[PDB]
């Protein structure tokens, strides 16, 4: 599923992502845009053999199990496949965890590079919430 901007914003809000760890909804929606372009089935193979999955491009090195990442861990206790679901509950559950690891949303490079500092409110502008 490809989410519409305001559609994800709402789904995210429903799921407790609005201002979690102090990150307004705008940040989260912005993170998703560049990471995945709102597409839930997005994957990307990194140079280190791990793979990013889902709307928030969550990595297999640490956070989910895909059975082909030598020496990895399954912090969020899920198969990576769950992160590609149209229902974003697991993408959120694990993101709530990733963001609590110590460095905030900086764990999402695309966030650090393309969202951090910018008028992130623009991504929730004129949505019903």
């Amino acid at each position: 599923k490809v989410f519409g901007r305001c559609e994800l914003a709402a789904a995210m809000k429903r799921h407790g992502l609005d201002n979690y760890r102090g990150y307004s909804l705008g940040n989260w929606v912005c993170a998703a845009k560049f990471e995945s372009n709102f597409n839930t089935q997005a994957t990307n193979r990194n140079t280190d053999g791990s793979t990013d999955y889902g709307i928030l491009q969550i990595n297999s090195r640490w956070w989910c199990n895909d059975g082909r990442t030598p020496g990895s861990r399954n912090l969020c206790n899920i198969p990576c496949s769950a992160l590609l679901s149209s229902d974003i509950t697991a993408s959120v559950n694990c993101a709530k965890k990733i963001v609590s690891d110590g460095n905030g949303m900086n764990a999402w490079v695309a966030w650090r590079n393309r969202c951090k500092g910018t008028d992130v409110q623009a991504w929730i502008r004129g949505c019903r919430l």
Side-chain angles (χ1 to χ4, degrees), residues 9-10 12-13 17-19 23-30 124 129:
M12 286 188 155
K13 186 166 194 167
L17 226 72
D18 185 36
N19 251 289
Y23 291 95
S24 59
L25 216 60
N27 283 295
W28 295 105
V29 174
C30 182
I124 59 161
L129 300 175

Side-chain angles (χ1 to χ4, degrees), residues 91-110:
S91 277
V92 172
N93 279 336
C94 190
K96 272 161 119 190
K97 209 171 300 203
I98 286 156
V99 73
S100 304
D101 210 62
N103 308 294
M105 293 200 61
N106 297 297
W108 289 271
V109 175

Side-chain angles (χ1 to χ4, degrees), residues 3 9-10 18 23 26 35 46-47 52-53 57 61 69 71 81 89 104 112-113 115 124:
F3 276 68
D18 185 36
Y23 291 95
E35 290 287 354
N46 305 132
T47 45
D52 308 318
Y53 296 89
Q57 282 286 289
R61 219 248 101 114
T69 306
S81 74
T89 304
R112 190 172 40 77
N113 291 345
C115 304
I124 59 161

Side-chain angles (χ1 to χ4, degrees), residues 16-95:
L17 226 72
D18 185 36
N19 251 289
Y20 188 77
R21 286 276 155 160
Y23 291 95
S24 59
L25 216 60
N27 283 295
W28 295 105
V29 174
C30 182
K33 178 69 186 163
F34 307 117
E35 290 287 354
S36 77
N37 212 5
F38 308 141
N39 186 354
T40 57
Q41 293 188 92
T43 67
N44 283 285
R45 193 66 169 286
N46 305 132
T47 45
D48 76 344
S50 68
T51 298
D52 308 318
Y53 296 89
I55 38 151
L56 287 176
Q57 282 286 289
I58 281 161
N59 189 246
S60 63
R61 219 248 101 114
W62 288 112
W63 307 104
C64 65
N65 183 48
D66 64 28
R68 62 167 198 189
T69 306
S72 61
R73 295 283 284 284
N74 193 340
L75 282 186
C76 304
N77 265 310
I78 56 189
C80 301
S81 74
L83 309 168
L84 312 171
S85 174
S86 42
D87 163 315
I88 74 163
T89 304
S91 277
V92 172
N93 279 336
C94 190

